[PDB]
C-alpha cells in the first residue's frame with residue numbers, strides 16, 4: 001500500500017529513470033517491501049537443472065549492475081537476469097531514454113547498454129554470492145547474467161568470451177543479448193550463420209572455464225546454462241533459420257522476447273527512439289513463443305518476456321510453450337506487488353483450469 005501510493009505519484013510526476021534509480025537505491029539499503037511465502041510446488045518449474053521456486057523472475061535491464069539482487073528477489077521473484085553487461089562500462093545514450101504511457105501500459109527505451117562494466121558487476125555478484133552462503137532465504141534463488149558488446153566493438157565474440165572469463169563462475173545461466181535495438185548493428189548477430197558462431201564460441205568458453213579452472217560459485221554448483229534473447233522484429237524465414245541453429249548448437253533455452261520497433265500505434269511514443277515493451281508487446285511475444293516452440297520442435301525451453309502483467313497473461317505464455325515468465329513493465333506500472341499478485345492470480349487459474357501442476361501446462365495450447 002505504502003509503495004503503491006508512492007509509485008502512482010512517481011509515474012505521473014517523476015522521470016522514468018530517476019524513479020528507477022530511486023527505487024534501486026531504496027533496494028541497496030534494504031528498505032523495499034518483502035514477499036514472504038515458501039511458494040506452492042504447484043507453480044514450480046524448471047529449465048534443465050535450474051529449479052525455479054515460482055515461475056516469475058525479473059528480466060534484464062532492471063538490475064544492469066547487480067547492485068540490488070537481494071531486495072529485488074525478496075519482492076517474490078525466483079530469479080533475476082542481471083545486465084546487460086559489457087566488458088567495459090558504458091554511459092549509454094542521451095537522456096531522457098525511458099518513456100511510459102499509463103493508459104496503454106507500455107515503455108519505450110533507448111538506454112544503449114548503460115552499465116558499470118563486467119569487472120565491477122562481477123564484484124557486485126561475488127558479494128551477493130557471498131551473502132547467499134550466510135543467508136538461507138536466498139539459497140534457492142537463481143541469478144542469470146545477460147552478456148553483450150560495447151558500442152564501438154566490431155567483433156561481438158571477443159566481448160562475450162571476455163565476460164564469461166570474469167562473471168561465468170557466479171552465473172546460473174548466461175543470456176546472449178543479440179536483440180538490442182539501441183546497440184547499432186547488434187540484431188544482425190541473430191542471422192543463422194553469425195548466431196551459430198556466437199553460441200558455439202560462447203559454449204566453448206563456458207566449457208573451457210571447467211577445463212582450465214568451489215569453481216561454480218552460483219546456486220546450481222554447476223556450469224551456467226546458455227540462453228539467447230531474440231528480437232520480435234524477424235521474418236518467418238529467419239525465425240525458422242534460427243531454430244535449426246538453436247537445435248544443432250543445443251542452446252539450453254531461448255528468451256522470447258526483447259523490445260519491438262514494430263509498435264507505432266502509441267501516440268506518446270511517436271518520435272521517441274527505442275524499443276516498445278509492455279501491454280502492446282504481449283500478443284507479439286506470445287506468437288513468437290508459439291512459432292519458435294514449433295520451429296524448434298518443443299526441444300528448446302522458453303523464458304517468456306513481453307507484456308506479462310497478470311496470471312492470465314502468464315498462463316497464456318506458459319501454454320504457448322514457456323517454462324518461466326520474466327517481468328519488467330509490470331514492476332514499473334503495477335509496482336512492488338507484481339510478483340505477489342501474479343503468483344496468486346496464476347495459482348487461482350492453474351486450479352480453475354484443472355492442472356495438477358505448472359509443468360503440465362507448458363505448451364498445452366498446441367495439444
Ligand SMILES: Cc1cc2nc3c(=O)[nH]c(=O)nc-3n(C[C@H](O)[C@H](O)[C@H](O)COP(=O)(O)O)c2cc1C
Pocket residue numbers: 059060061062064083084098107108109111113146177229257258259277278279281305306307308326327328329330
Ligand atoms: C529501460 C529498459 C531497459 C532494458 N534493458 C535491457 C537489457 O539491458 N537487456 C535485455 O536483455 N533486455 C532489456 N530490456 C528488455 C526487458 O528485459 C524486457 O524483455 C522488455 O521490457 C519486455 O518485457 P515487458 O513488456 O514485460 O517489460 C529493457 C527494458 C527496459 C524497459
Ligand SMILES: Cc1nnc2c3ccccc3c(N3CCc4ccccc4C3)nn12
Pocket residue numbers: 007010011015016017019020023024027032062068071072098331332335336
Ligand atoms: C515508477 C517508475 N517509473 N519508471 C520506472 C522504472 C523504469 C525502469 C525500470 C524500473 C522502474 C521502476 N521500478 C519500480 C519497481 C522496482 C522494484 C525494485 C527495484 C527497482 C524498481 C524500479 N519504477 N518506475
Ligand SMILES: O=C(O)c1cc(=O)[nH]c(=O)[nH]1
Pocket residue numbers: 061084109110111112113114177179180181182258259275
Ligand atoms: O540496454 C538497452 O538499451 C536495451 C537492451 C535490450 O536488450 N533491450 C532494450 O529494449 N534496451
